[PDB]
Design an enzyme around this catalytic site. Structure first.
Site, PDB file in Angstrom:
ATOM      1  N   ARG B  32       2.247   2.899   6.780  1.00  0.00           N
ATOM      2  CA  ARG B  32       1.473   2.913   5.545  1.00  0.00           C
ATOM      3  C   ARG B  32       2.403   3.132   4.358  1.00  0.00           C
ATOM      4  O   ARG B  32       3.209   4.070   4.351  1.00  0.00           O
ATOM      5  CB  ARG B  32       0.400   4.000   5.581  1.00  0.00           C
ATOM      6  N   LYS B 220     -11.606   1.341   1.967  1.00  0.00           N
ATOM      7  CA  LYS B 220     -11.694   2.797   2.024  1.00  0.00           C
ATOM      8  C   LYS B 220     -13.046   3.243   1.478  1.00  0.00           C
ATOM      9  O   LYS B 220     -13.392   2.936   0.331  1.00  0.00           O
ATOM     10  CB  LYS B 220     -10.540   3.424   1.239  1.00  0.00           C
TER      11      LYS B 220
END
Lengths: 462, 462, 462, 462
Positions: B32, B220
Site C-alpha cells: 500500500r 473505502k
C-alpha cells in the site's frame, strides 16, 4: 418420452419385418431370442429381419440371446399317459435314465439328484404344482412323500428350493448356442440359473474364446443360491435379470418382492443394467388388455428403479403382441414421468455432480462421450430428469446402451478432443430434437484418462 | 500455509529492497502506498524497489495506491497554540479561511460547512476528541455548544455523523496522484471517503482517461452515507475497504461490527475482494507485540471472511514493522486453519460444484484458467479448503489476484484448448509444490465461451 | 429486551440505593463484589442496599462474590526506583524475603519458588513484560536468563505458565471472605486462582462447611494451567468466567481468541453459565463512550454465545458507571437481536424438542418449572428466540437464573401437579406481559422424576 | 407382531366361534360383513359369535359393515339363456323394466341410463367383458355398437367410465342395512360407490338419525368421479377404502396404481384410516398358497402406507381361509419389518415431535391418552417404529382403533389428570408386555384442552 426400456421376446407372430417395424414404433427397444425354443435358422432369420428394419428405418435396437440353461426334468411315463398322484402316497425319483415311469416312480435327467438332496428337503414338480418331501435316499433313488394331489405328465420341470445344485453352469446346448451368439454378434447374453460367481466366469471365458469378449452378460437370478451369492454374481456380471416367476417357486413367497427390490437397488449402485422379467403382462397372451394387477406390478418394478421391463409370451406367441407392447410403453411413460432423481470415486463425484448441475439449471439433456458405455451408465445411476444422449464410436456400445434407462445412443465418426466433443455434442443435441436453441446442456466426458473413468463436466447453451 | 492476504503500507522504515524482501518472506502480499504523505519520487522508488525484489525472487506481489481523499479540517490558531474548550461554552466555526482561531471560533477548510449542517447536528473535531452540537447557522458561521472539555489544536479533522457532505469525490491532489498511479501501472486504487455510486464512477472515468481502465477500484467505506449506499457502491467497485476507525466516529458504535460483517458478506457473494483496515495492530507502532484485543479483532475479521487484512502505521513508520507483519501472518494462519468451506448462474454452479468436488475427493489444489481473474474469484467465494492456482496470460490479473484469499497466481504463455489446459495445469500443479504425485486436482476453465463465463470442471490425478 | 445478562462490579461510586436502582433500570442484572478491595462493613452495606432496592422495586438481581486469591509478587528494590534488565543477562529470584533487590536479584513472596520450578521453566514478571528462563535452582535462589530487555519495578506480579504451584485456591483471607459470603447468602462465588479440578473442590468443600451448599461456583480461567485443565474444571464448577486479560499474559496472543470461543462453546454444551470478563469497556473508566474495538469485542463475545458480560472498574470506581451499563445494554440488545437458535439423554431430547416446537409455532415464551434451575439452563442451551419464564419455589434458584441468557425468573409459592403448573404458568405468562391472549407458549417440566431431570413438554394457547 | 391390520370378510365357511378364534390367532383384526349377500339373522349371529369370542378370550376386534350400494345392472333374457354378441352389431339398452332381453336389446335397472349417457360414451357390461359405444339415445333406449365379441348373461354389472351417474347415495336396501348397522353397534360402515361429498353427508345424516353418530364412515372410491372429488370426499369421511378392482374397470389401467398411492398418501396426511381392498389374495379362494404377484401387490400396498389390507372371498367362502389370513399376516410382518418412520398446528407439532423423541431414545412404545381416537391416529401418521398403546374410556374408540396401523387399544376406567396418566400408563405399559423395566416410553395426551387437540409429550423410564 418414456425412459424405461422394453425387451420383447420375438416369436412366430412377431418375427416378420412388418411386425418388428410396428413393434419398434410402439416402444420395443431390445429383441429377446429365447433359446428354450426355436432353432438356429428361426433365430437367425429374426436377427436378419430386425437388422434390416433398423437399416431401412435408422432405428436402433439391441439383441439379447436368452439361454435355455441346465435344468432338472422328469422323463417318460408308461404309454406316455399322465398319472394321478395322491397326497400321502410314497413316490420315488430315480437317476436311472432308462426307467419309464408310473404312479410310483419316475426318472429324472440329473444324475446328481441323490447327492444334492437331503432327507426332509422339498421336491417340487411341474412349476411347483406337486410338492413332495424327501423321506429317504438309497442308491440311485430319492424316495418321497407326496404332499398334495396332482396329475404328473411327462418331462416336467423339477425345482429344489434352497438346495445347492451341482449342475454345470452351461448345458452342452448352451455352449453351442453361445457360439451362435458370437457368430451373430448379439449384444447381450442372458444366462439362465446363475448360482455363483464361478458360473459367470465360465460363461465369460466361453464367450471370450469365440470373440464375444465385448458381449455383456446378464445373469438370471432364479433361486435362493443365486440370491445368497448375489453380490459376487453382480460383480462378475454386466447386469441382472430378475426372474420373479422362478423365484416364486424357489424361495418363501413373501421374500420375492424384496429380492427384486434389493437386486434392482444394488444394480443401480453398481451402474449395471437390470431387467425385470417374467409374469409381467402374461394375461395378454389371450386378452387385448392387461389386468389391473399386472399393470401395477409393472409400474412398481419401474418405481423400484429397473432399467428395463420384459415381455415374454405376450410378444412372442400371444394373440395381441402389438397391444402388449403399446400398453407396456404407456405404463412406462406414465410411471417414468413421476419419478425423481436420486442425488444422495472420481467418476461418481463428477457424474453425480453433473446430474445435480443439470437439475439446478433445468437442462433437458446430458450429453455423454463414452467408449464402453460406463459414463452413460454412471449418469443414469442418479435417475436424471434429463435424457442422456450418449455419443460413441463403438457400435456394440451404441447397441448395448439401448437397454439402459433414459439413454439415447448415437454412433459418431469420432471424438478428437474435449473442445471438439463440446462443438459436436451441441450440434447433435440440436439435431436430436431433444433440446433446442437456448436450452442448457451438460456435457460429461473423460479427458486425458484411460477409457474407464469419467472426469469432466461442462455446461453449454445451445 | 495462510490464505488471508496481507496489505502492508510501505514507508521510510520498510522501503529498501532488503526490507521488502524480508516483508514478503514474513507474509506481505500487497504494498500500500498511502498518498496522504510522501512525494512522487519516494513512492516511485518504492514501486521500483518492490518490482526489483519481485524480479530477483520470482515472487509476485501487488501494488495499491491509496488516495488521501477530500477532508474537512479546522485551520490555524492564534500563535499556533492549542486552546482549551470547555463543556457548555459556545464555539463557532467559520468558512472564512482567513480567520485565525481562538477559544471562541476557528475556520474550517470546507465552504459547504454552513450548507450541509442543520441545527442539532453533531460536529466532532480531532478524531472525535471534542463533540459539539449545532445551535445556529447564520452567514458563514456554524454556532455550536461544546459538549465536553478538550484541547483544540491546529488543522484537525472534522466529522459530521449522519450528514450528507457535498465534498467532491476527488481532491485536486487526488486527480494528480491517480494519474501518477496510471503512469506507474499500479494494480489497485483505494479511493477514500466513497459516499455514493457516482463517486466511484467519477474515479473510474478518471482512470480510464489515462490508460487505467484495468486498474481495480477498492472503495473505502467510512461514514453513514456510504453505508446507506453500500449496495450501489459495491456494484460499481471492484472491491471494498472497511475503514473501521472512521465508521467508529460516524455511526452508532454498536453498529460498526455489523457494518463490517455485512459488508464482508456482501463482497464475498459478489466475488469482489474485501480488505479490513484501520485500528488493526496499531499498538505495534510502539510495541514489539500486539494487544490481546487487537489480535482478537483481526481474527474475528478473518472469521467474518475478509480476503485481506491491512497494516498502516505499524508497517510504514513504526518501530517493529517485521514483527507486526510476522504476528499478523501467524494470526492469519492460525485462524485460516480452523475455517470451513461455505458451499451453500452457470459460472457459480460450476465453481460451487468444483469446490464441493475438490472437498469430497480431498484435493489440495484447484487450478483455474482465468483472463480477468473472475473464475478464480468465483471459486474463492465458497472458501475452498484447497489452494487456488490461477493460471493467466494477463500480468495485471496475476498481480490483482494476489489480494484474493487463498489464490496463488501464475503467469503463463497462452493455453489454446481445454486439453492443453489440463496437460499444462498438471505440470504447473507439480511445479508449484502445492500438490504432489498422486494428489487429486480439480481444474476449472471456460470452454467455447466468452471471457465472462466459467463452465467446465475436470478432475485429474497428478 | 436484551437476553444477555450484565454483571456490574459495585464500588463507592455505585453502592448507594439510588445508584443501584438506576443501574438495574439501565440493564444491570448481577452485582459483583470484588473482595480484592473493601471491608466487610462496606460489602455488607452493598448487599443490604441491593436487597432494599429489590424489595422496594420488585426487580430481581443476583449477588456474586469474587475472591482476590493468592499471588506471587516480586518485592522491594534498592532505593525507590526501577532497575533495567538486559536480554541475555543472568538474573536471580530469591526466596529470602529480607533481601532488597537490584539489577542482579530480587526477592519473591513465595518461599516454594525453588521447589515448584524446574530448569527450563519460564518466569514472567509484571504482566509478562519481562520473560526469563530458569537455568539453575540452588539454595534460596532461582537463577535465570532474561529473555528480553525491560524495566523491573517494585512489587510486580509473577506468572509461571503451566507450572503447578503448591499454594491454595484460597488463602486465609480468601476463606474468611467466602465465609462472609455464606453468612450473607450470596448467590455466586467467582473463584480466583483455579488451576485444576481439585481447586474447585476445595472451594466447594469450604462453602459446604458453612451453609453455602446452594451457592454456585464460577471458576475463573485466568492462566495456562487452568486452560489445559479446563474440561475437569468446567465439570466440577457451576459456571465459568473467561478472564481474557489475565489469560493473555500466559499464552500465545493468537491463541487467546480461540481459548475464549472454545470455552464458551463447551459451557453452552454443558448447560452451564459463562461470563466474558476483563477488558470489556475499560476505556469508560475515563470516557463517557467506549472504543469501537471494545464494542466489537463485546459483541463478538455475545455472538460466541456468552450468557453474560461483565463490567469491572467501569462500574465500580470509574467516572461514568451508568453510561457504561447503558451502552453495554445497547450492545447486548443489538447483538442478541440478530442471533439464531442452535437446534443441533432425556432432558436434552425434551428441551431441544421444546425449543424446536416453540420456534415452529412462533411461541414468544417457554415457561419452565424448576427447583435447582437445571431445566431453564437446559432450554437456554439452544438459544431460543422465545424468552424463558422460569417458575420456582426456590429463592436461591430465582436469583441465580438472573445470570442465564434469556431467562426471567419468577418465585412462586408452590406447584402441586403438572396440570396446576399449566394453569399457573398460563396465568403468570399473561401477567408477565411477555405473552398475550392467543399466543402459543411451550411449557417444560419434570413429571414423576427427581429434580435433576426434565421430561415433559406441553403446548398451550393463552 | 405386524403393525398392518387385517380385515377379513366373514361368511358361512368362517362364521363359527371356533373359526373366528383361529382367525384372530392368525392375525385377523376386523370382521367385514358384506351386505351384498346374507340376511340380518346370519350377520347378526356373525356379530354375536365374534363378541362372544372377544369376551371369552380378551381379544379385541372391530366390526365393519360393507354396503351393497346402488348399482346399474342389465336384467333378464329370453328363457334366461345367454346370448352371443358380435363385434360391430347394434345392441340397445332400454330403461323399460318390463322388457325381457335378447341378442339385440336388454333392459337396465336404472331409469337415468338414457339421461346420464351421451353419444360416444363407453358402456361396459359384466366386469368389463363386453364394451360398447353409444351411437344414439332415443326415448327410453340407449342404442350402441358392440365393440367386441362376448356372451351376455342375465343380471350383469354395467360400468360407465367417466360418467357422472345420478344414482342415489344409498339404495333403499342400503338405508335399511345401515339401520341394522346402528342397531348392532357396528364400528365402521364402508359405503359403496361414493362419488361426491354430498353422498358422504347423506350417509352421515342417516347414521345420525338412528343413533350411529359415533360410527366411522369409510368411503369406497370406485370410479373416476369419486377420484375427481377425492379431496372433498376424504374431508367428509373418516377413512377410505381403495377398491382397486372397480377402478380397474372405470379408469385407464395405467392410472389405477397412482390412484391407490395418492389416496393412501392423502389419507396418511389427513390422519385418516385407509384400507386396500379387492383382488388381494383371490387365488386362495381355491388354492392353499397365493401367487407371487398377489403377495407383491399386497406388500407394495403396505409399503405405500396402507393402515389395513382386506380379504374378501378368500376368507368368506374360500377353501383355505386360515391359510389366507396366515400368509397375509406373514406378508404384513415381513413388510412392516423394513419400513421406516416418516418424520417430515399444535397436535401435529407435538405428535411428530413425540415420534422423533421416541426414535432418538429407542423407545419401544408410545402411550397415548385418547377419547375419540385422534391422538392415536395423529401419532401413527409418522409411521413410528414404536407400537402405539392407546388408552381410552370410550369403547367405540377402542374398537375403531383396531383398524389403525400399529395401534393397540386398551380400555381403562378413567384418567383424571396428566400425572395420573403417566402413573397408570407406565403400569399398563409393563402389563401389556410391549415394554419392560428400563425401557423408555413416550406418553402423549391433551392437557387442559378439550378432546381433539393433543398438546403434551412426556418421557418416562419404566
Amino acid at each position: 418420452m418414456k425412459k424405461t426400456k422394453i425387451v420383447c421376446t420375438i416369436g412366430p407372430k412377431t418375427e416378420s419385418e412388418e411386425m418388428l417395424a410396428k413393434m419398434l414404433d410402439a416402444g420395443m427397444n431390445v429383441m429377446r431370442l429365447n433359446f428354450s425354443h426355436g432353432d438356429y435358422a428361426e433365430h437367425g432369420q429374426r436377427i436378419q429381419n430386425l437388422r434390416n428394419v433398423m437399416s431401412k428405418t435408422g432405428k436402433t435396437a439391441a439383441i439379447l440371446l436368452d439361454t435355455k440353461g441346465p435344468e432338472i426334468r422328469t422323463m417318460k411315463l408308461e404309454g406316455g399317459n399322465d398319472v394321478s398322484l395322491k397326497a400321502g402316497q410314497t413316490f420315488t425319483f430315480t437317476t436311472d435314465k432308462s426307467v419309464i415311469g408310473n404312479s410310483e416312480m419316475v426318472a429324472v435327467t440329473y444324475e446328481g439328484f441323490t447327492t444334492d438332496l437331503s432327507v426332509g428337503n422339498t421336491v417340487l414338480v411341474d412349476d411347483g404344482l406337486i410338492g413332495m418331501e424327501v423321506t429317504a435316499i438309497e442308491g440311485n433313488k430319492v424316495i418321497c412323500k407326496v404332499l398334495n394331489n396332482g396329475d404328473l405328465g411327462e418331462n416336467k420341470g423339477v425345482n429344489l428350493p434352497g438346495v445347492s445344485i451341482a449342475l454345470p453352469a452351461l448345458a452342452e446346448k448352451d455352449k453351442q448356442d453361445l457360439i451362435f451368439g458370437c457368430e451373430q454378434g448379439v449384444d447381450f447374453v442372458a444366462a439362465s440359473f446363475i448360482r455363483k460367481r464361478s458360473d459367470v466366469i465360465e460363461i465369460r471365458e466361453h464367450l471370450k474364446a469365440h470373440g464375444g469378449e465385448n458381449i455383456h452378460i446378464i445373469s438370471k437370478i432364479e433361486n435362493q443360491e443365486g440370491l445368497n451369492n448375489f453380490d459376487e454374481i453382480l460383480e462378475a456380471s454386466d447386469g441382472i435379470m430378475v426372474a420373479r416367476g422362478d423365484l416364486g417357486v424357489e424361495i418363501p413367497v413373501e421374500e420375492v418382492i424384496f429380492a427384486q427390490k434389493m437386486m434392482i437397488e444394488k444394480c443401480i449402485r453398481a451402474r449395471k443394467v437390470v431387467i425385470t422379467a417374467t409374469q409381467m403382462l402374461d394375461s395378454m397372451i389371450k386378452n387385448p388388455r392387461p389386468t389391473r394387477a399386472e399393470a401395477g406390478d409393472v409400474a412398481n418394478s419401474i418405481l423400484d428403479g429397473t432399467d428395463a421391463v420384459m415381455l415374454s409370451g405376450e410378444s412372442a406367441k400371444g394373440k395381441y403382441p402389438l397391444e402388449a407392447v403399446s400398453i407396456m410403453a404407456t405404463i412406462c411413460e406414465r410411471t417414468d414421468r413421476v419419478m425423481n432423481s436420486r442425488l444422495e470415486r472420481i467418476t461418481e463425484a463428477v457424474c453425480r455432480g453433473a446430474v445435480e448441475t443439470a437439475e439446478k439449471l433445468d437442462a433437458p439433456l446430458i450429453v455423454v462421450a463414452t467408449q464402453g458405455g460406463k459414463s452413460a451408465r454412471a449418469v443414469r445411476k442418479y435417475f436424471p430428469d434429463a435424457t442422456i444422449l450418449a455419443l460413441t464410436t463403438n457400435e456394440k456400445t451404441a447397441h448395448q446402451l439401448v437397454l439402459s434407462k433414459g439413454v439415447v445412443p448415437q454412433l459418431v465418426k469420432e471424438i478428437t478432443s474435449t473442445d471438439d466433443f463440446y462443438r459436436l455434442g451441441k450440434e447433435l443435441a440440436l439435431q436430436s430434437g431433444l433440446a433446442h436453441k437456448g436450452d442448457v446442456v451438460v456435457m460429461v466426458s473423460g479427458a486425458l484418462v484411460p477409457s474407464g473413468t469419467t472426469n469432466t463436466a461442462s455446461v453449454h447453451v445451445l
